[PDB]
Design a protein around this ligand. Structure first.
Ligand SMILES: [Mg+2]
Ligand SMILES: [Zn+2]
Ligand SMILES: [Zn+2]
Lengths: 99, 209, 28, 42, 115, 70, 96
């Protein structure tokens, strides 16, 4: 184990994550579920229409408005961030690899 | 079986060199378990058991099995009940009809109610790419088709491409398994979905005699 | 019973101690 | 991480509805008499 | 443990069983339920009357026609041996539980001892 | 010709309409693209009219030239 | 340990792709038998082993095969050429 612990392997994972400042969210009952969210960044403010699992995840997280939220398209993890000191810096959906 | 030879010589003469040369010459189809003498002194089981385990590892077995799998994208799912209410018990659910789509066409399958139960367990909806093994009746949910990738502009779904080839492809699978692998499989089976099974799964895999 | 009334006699003895087809199957 | 205790109002709470929201900047309003007439007609 | 491994015990078990392919099941329920059942072999056929506990076991096993089942008259336990070959065509994919076996021969009720 | 009474009701209806599809309407999947440039990697709906955009440049173009609510 | 969950998922995803494809179900071939003692009975097992229906499959397969041989004799020289006759296509489809 000591010998193997000193041999490192770097693996690159490219994840699609949206990082944005937040704008009001409509969740509705079955008419399975209808919902819309809006995200603001430094140069865009646009509406996304959610699906079943995204609605479930946002209900579980109980995300508020006017704060900052990071959502990964592939993994689906949602990371909360404090209120806008900070602000989105560009495009709503970025393509950045994590090593 | 049981033939033994000893590579005898002084330090830095080529004993390990000859051993690794033998391993290379034998090829990747012949088992070759390297070892050192100190590794036999275990703290979980007697050194005799560890010698027996390693000794069996070097008896490879090549077993071949032909498997038939149904894979594709679900287009229809129309459960049917028995023709007569008196035919069965309770729900009285009869066969289910599933429509799969592949790169080479579509096929309509007639499935057992057990396969329908597997479908319900895997939470499969229309458009999901699935995978059914007629060998065991096991249903796997590969994911959603890339055709429906842009159905919703924000959704957490593992979109997967449409399966290539025919919907029903039969393949002959060949694998090399050691005798020790079978011994481990019998000793510590991975089957079972009970709470007791999960608690045992969380336990460390300590070697046993 | 709560309005100091006796219960049914058969029900009394049953509580002290404690037609049509529903399923037919045949191979075609 | 996750809030194990939540306070709710029986009037506002339901699982059905989840909702949250925040040269003079003001929302545009449409003086389209045709569109308003359509709205009242339909 | 080594010493006891070198001694073997040859024990005899006597088993009484009824095995056969169920032909027809008819269950009537209000009160307690009553029903009649017919089991056939390759050279025998018999109609039996079922008690409440036997019917409960049949329901909890979810037995259908054409199935070969075994019942221990001591305990009444019901085991589904398998399905007939004639029902094989009915599906494209088969579950793990399904089994195709022939109809047992001889007398419906048999006594057997195993060492 | 189409308004002419010599072209009968059944003839007209058969010739124009019957050749049109009546039961199948979409059997390929549905593909949404950027309203400016046809992209699909990312999509969202503009707050002003709900047409679909993919990038900041496309958002500026939709706001200046395109958007139909103004 | 929460910070390592993403890495764990990544490694498991990387290994599953190779693990699932080229493995032989040892349980399917009865190589694993320590669970069989829980849900099976000795005399039940020996009776089920005695009542196997291989003869039924073989007999029906031979009746199909002789019917197919008769049909192939009737058809003659079978070919996969583009069909220009309903009868020929129907016979080829029945053969396949
Ligand atoms: Mg050396
Ligand atoms: Zn664009
Ligand atoms: Zn617009």
């Amino acid at each position: 184990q000591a010998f193997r612990k000193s041999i490192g392997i770097k693996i690159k994972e490219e994840t699609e994550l949206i990082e944005g400042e937040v704008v009001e969210i409509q969740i509705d009952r079955s008419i399975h579920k209808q919902g819309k969210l809006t995200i603001k960044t430094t140069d865009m403010e646009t509406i996304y229409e959610l699906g079943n699992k995204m609605i479930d995840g946002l209900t579980k997280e109980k995300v508020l408005a006017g704060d900052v939220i990071s959502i990964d398209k592939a993994s689906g993890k949602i990371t909360k961030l404090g209120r806008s000191v900070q602000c989105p810096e560009g495009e709503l959906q970025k393509r950045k690899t994590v090593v | 079986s049981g033939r033994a030879i000893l590579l005898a010589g002084g330090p830095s003469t080529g004993k390990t060199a000859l051993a690794l040369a033998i391993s290379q010459e034998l090829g990747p189809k012949v088992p070759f378990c390297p070892l050192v003498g100190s590794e036999l002194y275990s703290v979980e089981v007697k050194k005799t058991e560890t010698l027996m385990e390693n000794f069996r590892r070097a008896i490879g077995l090549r077993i071949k099995e032909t498997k038939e799998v149904y894979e594709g994208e679900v287009t229809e799912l129309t459960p049917e009940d028995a023709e007569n209410p008196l035919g069965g018990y309770g729900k009285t659910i009869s066969h289910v009809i599933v429509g799969l789509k592949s790169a080479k066409g579509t096929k309509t399958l007639r499935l057992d109610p057990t396969i329908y139960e597997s479908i319900q367990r895997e939470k499969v909806s229309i458009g999901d790419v699935i995978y059914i093994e007629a060998n065991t009746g096991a249903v796997k949910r590969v994911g959603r088709s890339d055709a429906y990738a842009t159905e919703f502009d924000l959704e957490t779904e593992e979109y997967v491409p449409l399966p290539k080839g025919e919907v029903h492809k039969k393949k002959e699978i060949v694998q090399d398994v050691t005798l020790h692998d079978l011994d481990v499989a019998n000793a510590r089976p991975q089957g079972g979905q009970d709470v007791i099974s999960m608690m045992g799964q969380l336990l460390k895999p300590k070697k046993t005699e | 019973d709560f309005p100091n009334a006796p219960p049914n006699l058969k029900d009394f003895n049953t509580n002290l101690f404690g037609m049509k087809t529903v399923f037919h199957s045949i191979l075609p | 991480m996750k809030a194990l205790v939540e306070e709710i109002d029986k009037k506002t709470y339901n699982p059905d509805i989840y909702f949250t929201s925040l040269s003079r900047p003001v929302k545009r309003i449409n003086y389209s008499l045709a569109d308003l007439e359509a709205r009242l007609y339909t | 443990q080594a010493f006891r491994k070198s001694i073997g015990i040859k024990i005899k078990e006597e088993t009484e069983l009824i095995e056969g392919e169920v032909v027809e099941i008819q269950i009537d329920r209000s009160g307690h339920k009553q029903g009649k059942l017919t089991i056939k072999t390759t050279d025998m056929e018999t109609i039996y009357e079922l008690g409440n506990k036997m019917i409960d076991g049949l329901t909890k096993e979810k037995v259908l026609a054409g199935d070969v089942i075994s019942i221990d008259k001591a305990s009444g336990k019901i085991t589904k041996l398998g399905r007939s070959f004639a029902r094989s065509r009915d599906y494209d994919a088969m579950g793990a539980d399904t089994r195709f076996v022939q109809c047992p021969e001889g007398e419906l009720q048999k006594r057997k001892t195993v060492v | 010709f189409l308004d002419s009474a010599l072209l009968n009701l059944m003839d007209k209806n058969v010739i124009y309409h019957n050749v049109y599809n009546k039961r199948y309407f979409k059997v390929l999947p549905l593909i949404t693209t950027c309203s400016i440039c046809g992209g699909y990697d990312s999509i969202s709906s503009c707050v002003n009219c709900g047409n679909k955009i993919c990038s900041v440049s496309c958002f500026k173009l939709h706001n200046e030239t395109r958007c139909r609510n103004r | 340990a929460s910070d390592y969950k993403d890495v764990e998922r990544t490694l498991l995803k990387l290994f599953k792709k190779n693990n699932q494809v080229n493995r032989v179900d040892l349980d399917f071939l009865n190589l694993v038998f320590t669970l069989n003692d829980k849900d099976l009975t000795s005399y039940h097992a020996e009776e089920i082993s005695k009542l196997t229906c291989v003869k039924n499959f073989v007999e029906e397969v031979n009746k199909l095969r002789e019917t197919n041989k008769q049909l192939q004799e009737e058809f003659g020289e079978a070919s996969f050429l583009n069909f220009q006759d309903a009868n020929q296509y129907f016979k080829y489809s029945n053969k396949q």
